[PDB]
Design a protein around this ligand. Structure first.
Ligand code: SAH
Ligand code: ZN
Length: 782
DNA sequence: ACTTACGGAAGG
DNA sequence: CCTTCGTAAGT
């Protein structure tokens, strides 16, 4: 319940949203060259007295006039000018959080006569050096710039605009300026060439040798292995049943018609039965002799099909390899599976994890090879204990982030740049010298990640205007202040999907506006955790930020079928951005089900409290072999104890898909001597406004998926689906951890409520691993 | 320390 | 027009 401790930059950005806020036209000079069409190229000109030059900006009438950064000028004797659009900040995803003097370069350009220019706008390109050591100089320069801008605005003088980033709504973010590709004055525009290449890579182009084509840039050819959409050849938490994956085919022939492709076919284990898909590798295929003639537009990508001997030695949980293996033959007519009677042949960053929790993000990030987890901050004792247990080489501060930040800023001597409450200062002054000597200092942290609390942004929160929820939503400012003070090379933020829509997006827009103020490149997206190898409907919003000299990571490619449409962020002007595709209509791998996740764990009764057990059966599914590994000790296979009435209700729920409280008979039970009603009073009382409370007192489906992991699985909770598919009990701690992708060797601390809170709060380790892989690729790109 | 009671907006 | 996805008050 502490007000966030912030630097003055973040405090100034958020303002009131912070609780603790404190006609003559003539060429100038000679020519310098000619275009490919023999047109002289000039660099300087005069248009009615005002001066136009390559690298400046010009104005066109449109309501505010449009601004165009001049790329080149040339001459019919008609004077011409090519310019790239400079979008204003208010017309971007920033909205009302943008400055009135900042312009963003876009990939849209136009050619216009010099007579159409309304005037010349004072325009500069801003490129400040990056580093924590330039913060004070940047602060002084920004104060001077603000004073000059206010002075000019008082006297009604023309505005002076600056540009430091390029706005990509198609890539969804703000990237670094290609300073070497703009203002060349050579008759060649990079955006024009990019547009031409994008237009070219869209049509059907049969190759010269009549053996392949160029669908969407991909160069398919005969004997290649391709993906085909399965359509071209429900209850709560069970919407993935009936969803099929990509049909893997071999390009056999190019049948002339403007042509068609004749392909063979491969069968997956799930095409035989659901029991065969359970006990089978996710990358297994069956040879068949069925050929289909398809249009060339039905192909969805390329893959490799090997034998079991030539499969890659490295095995990862989040599978990013488009490699399958074929060993058996599926007879379509008989339905049998027989044997086969042309297949295929340093950067670790010192990391600070704020709001660490039990270490779900840190585990995946450091498993990918990009994070060190050198420092962690987590103010809850059980979660900090779990983090220390799972990352023994990490320095964990079990303290408020607003106190750790105050201690860090006070250690560095920047007490005048800290906006903190008296309580934060008093608690920071009460830190022993041992902890104040191991605190991180700016220049030692190259990566800051972590997810601030989402309980104030979640749509479940009925009371999101209370003091507690308003304080929880204020932890964004402390995270941004950590990023501003330390200035790491990379920055990662995770929150709920509703974080981008909360308060009309004003919290989201004010976040990017902060990161852009520090001089970052910011990109945003929304990812579904169930498309990366878990049986869970978990939609999370991610924000990547990088220094101007670094490369922004790409988004991981989902490889599992999941019944979730495209998750779009609304930018502005009716535009939307989807970070990744939707795998509902096809993906390389089949969805993970509940039985694949928790099918092999031994049965336990209600209220089991044995924290140490032994595995009874061996792993069967592909998930169980990957989630257990070499673990021989079963930990935290314990479930919460239900009272007599709740246990009585649980035993009367049928063990069939779609079962919930609607199947409870209407009768009076006697427990003690108390007489109660079997059906809870609150469920039919407000069922009309809550979709009938579907899923409450509901069992999981063996072929479905787990619902969203909450910090307190209850029978009568907004989720509801917490009962075992076959056992009269709630899901154990270990089962809820497996549903989140946690390896069986992971440890949790506290009582059962603390462990459940730890699991329900954590980022799925597979998603963190995928993000870390993308970050590793970005780091190697530099 | 548990158990019950339960609003409304963003996307489709 | 369904389909998602935690905090307070009462024992
Ligand atoms: N002000 C604060 N200072 C430090 N930790 C905080 C905090 N406010 C909330 N937290 C912690 O942040 C955690 C949620 S973030 C979840 C942990 C992490 N994202 C993961 O993937 O595992 C909670 O457990 C809470 O204890
Ligand atoms: Zn151009």
């Amino acid at each position: 319940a502490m007000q966030a401790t912030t630097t003055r930059l973040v405090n100034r950005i958020w303002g009131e949203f912070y609780s603790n806020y404190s006609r003559e036209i003539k060429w100038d000079g000679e020519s310098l060259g000619k275009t490919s069409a023999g047109e002289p190229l000039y660099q300087q000109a005069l248009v009615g007295g005002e001066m136009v030059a390559v690298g400046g900006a010009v104005t066109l009438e449109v309501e505010m006039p449009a601004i165009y950064f001049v790329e080149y000028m040339f001459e019919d004797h008609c004077k011409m000018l090519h310019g790239r659009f400079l979008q204003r900040g208010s017309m971007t995803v920033l909205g009302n959080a943008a400055n009135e003097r900042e312009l963003f370069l876009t990939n849209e350009c136009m050619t216009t006569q010099l007579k159409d220019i309304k005037g010349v706008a004072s325009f500069e390109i801003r490129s400040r050096p990056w580093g924590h050591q330039y913060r004070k100089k940047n602060i002084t320069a920004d104060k001077l710039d603000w004073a000059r801008a206010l002075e000019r605005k008082v006297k009604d003088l023309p505005t002076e605009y600056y540009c430091k980033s390029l706005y990509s709504p198609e890539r969804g973010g703000f990237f670094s300026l290609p300073l070497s590709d703009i203002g060349r004055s050579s008759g060649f525009c990079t955006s024009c060439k990019i547009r031409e290449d994008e237009e070219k890579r869209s049509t059907i182009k049969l190759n010269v040798s009549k053996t392949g084509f160029f669908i969407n840039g991909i160069e398919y050819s005969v004997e290649d292995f391709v993906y085909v959409n399965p359509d071209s050849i429900s209850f709560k938490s069970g919407r993935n049943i009936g969803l099929r994956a990509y049909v893997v085919c071999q390009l056999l022939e190019i049948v002339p018609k403007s042509f068609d492709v004749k392909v063979r076919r491969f069968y997956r284990p799930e095409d035989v039965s659901a029991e065969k898909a359970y006990a089978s590798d996710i990358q297994e295929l069956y040879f068949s002799q069925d050929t289909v003639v398809l249009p060339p537009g039905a192909l969805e990508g390329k893959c490799e099909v090997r034998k079991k001997s030539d499969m890659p030695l490295s095995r990862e949980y989040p599978i990013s390899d488009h490699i399958f293996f074929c060993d058996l033959f599926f007879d379509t007519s008989k339905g049998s599976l027989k044997q086969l009677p042309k297949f295929s042949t340093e950067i670790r960053l010192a990391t600070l994890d704020i709001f660490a929790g039990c270490g779900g993000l840190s585990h995946g990030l450091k498993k990918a090879g990009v994070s060190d987890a050198k420092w962690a901050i987590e103010y809850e004792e059980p979660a900090g204990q779990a983090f220390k247990q799972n990352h023994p080489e990490s320095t964990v501060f079990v303290d408020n982030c607003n106190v750790i930040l105050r201690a860090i800023m006070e250690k560095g001597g920047d007490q005048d740049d800290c906006v903190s409450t008296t309580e934060a200062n008093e608690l920071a002054a009460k830190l022993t010298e041992e902890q104040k000597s191991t605190l991180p200092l700016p220049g030692q942290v190259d990566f800051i990640n972590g997810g601030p609390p989402c309980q104030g942004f979640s749509g479940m929160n009925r009371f999101n205007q209370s003091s507690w929820s308003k304080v929880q939503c204020e932890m964004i400012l402390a995270f941004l202040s950590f990023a501003d003070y330390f200035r790491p090379r990379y920055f990662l933020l995770e929150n709920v999907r509703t974080f981008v829509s909360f308060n009309k997006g004003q919290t989201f827009q004010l976040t990017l506006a902060s990161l852009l103020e520090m001089g970052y490149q910011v990109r945003f997206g929304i990812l579904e955790a169930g498309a990366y190898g878990v049986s869970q409907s978990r939609k999370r919003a991610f924000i990547w930020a990088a220094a101007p000299e670094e490369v922004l990571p790409e988004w991981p490619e989902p490889m599992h079928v999941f019944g979730v449409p495209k998750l779009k962020i609304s930018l502005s002007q009716g535009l939307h951005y989807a970070a990744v595709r939707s795998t509902a209509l096809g993906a390389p791998f089949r969805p993970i089900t509940v039985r694949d996740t928790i099918g092999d764990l031994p049965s336990v009764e209600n209220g089991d409290s044995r924290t140490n057990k032994e595995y009874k059966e061996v792993a069967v599914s592909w998930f169980q072999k990957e989630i257990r590994g070499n673990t021989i000790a079963l930990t935290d296979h314990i479930c919460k104890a239900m009272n007599e009435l709740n246990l009585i209700r649980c035993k009367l729920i049928p063990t069939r898909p779609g079962a919930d409280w609607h199947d409870l008979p209407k009768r009076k039970v006697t427990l003690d001597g108390r007489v109660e009603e079997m059906i809870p009073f609150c469920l039919p009382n407000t069922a009309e406004r809550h979709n009938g409370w579907k899923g409450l007192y509901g069992r999981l489906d063996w072929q479905g998926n787990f619902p969203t992991s909450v910090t307190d699985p209850q029978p009568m909770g907004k989720v509801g689906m917490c009962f075992h598919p076959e056992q009269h009990r709630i899901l154990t701690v270990r089962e809820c951890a497996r549903s989140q992708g946690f390896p069986d060797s992971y440890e949790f601390a506290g009582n059962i409520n603390h462990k459940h809170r730890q699991i329900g709060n954590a980022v799925p380790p597979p998603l963190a691993f995928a993000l870390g892989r993308k970050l590793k690729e970005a780091l190697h790109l530099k």
